[PDB]
Amino acid sequence: KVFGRCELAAAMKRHGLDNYRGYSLGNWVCAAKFESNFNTQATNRNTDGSTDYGILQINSRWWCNDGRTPGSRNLCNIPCSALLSSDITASVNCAKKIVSDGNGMNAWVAWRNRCKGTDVQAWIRGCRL
Ligand code: NA
Numbered sequence: 060k061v062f063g064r065c066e067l068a069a070a071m072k073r074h075g076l077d078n079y080r081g082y083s084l085g086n087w088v089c090a091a092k093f094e095s096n097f098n099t100q101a102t103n104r105n106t107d108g109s110t111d112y113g114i115l116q117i118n119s120r121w122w123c124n125d126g127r128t129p130g131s132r133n134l135c136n137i138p139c140s141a142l143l144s145s146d147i148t149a150s151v152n153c154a155k156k157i158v159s160d161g162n163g164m165n166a167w168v169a170w171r172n173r174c175k176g177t178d179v180q181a182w183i184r185g186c187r188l
Pocket of ligand 1: 119120121122123124125128131132133
């Protein structure tokens with residue numbers, strides 16, 4: 060599923076991401092935009108052999124099991140394929156654990172490099188929220 064901007068904002072708000080750990084909703088929409096272009100089926104491989112999955116590009120090195128990342132962890136207790144679903148529940152629940160791990164949204168390289176320090180509220184302008 061490729062989400063619309065306001066569609067994703069509403070779904071993220073319904074799942075409790077608005078101001079979660081102090082990050083306003085525009086931060087999450089901005090992160091999703093530059094991580095996956097709003098596409099739940101996005102995958103990208105990392106140099107160490109791990110893979111990032113779904114709309115928030117969650118990494119198999121720590122957070123999910125994809126059967127091909129030896130020596131890694133599965134801290135969200137999910138198969139990585141679950142993160143590619145049109146239902147974003149698994150991605151949002153896992154993202155809540157990531158952002159709570161001490162580094163905040165700096166865990167997402169695209170957020171730090173393309174969202175942090177910008178007017179992130181622009182990403183929800185015009186939406187009925
Ligand atoms: Na893993």
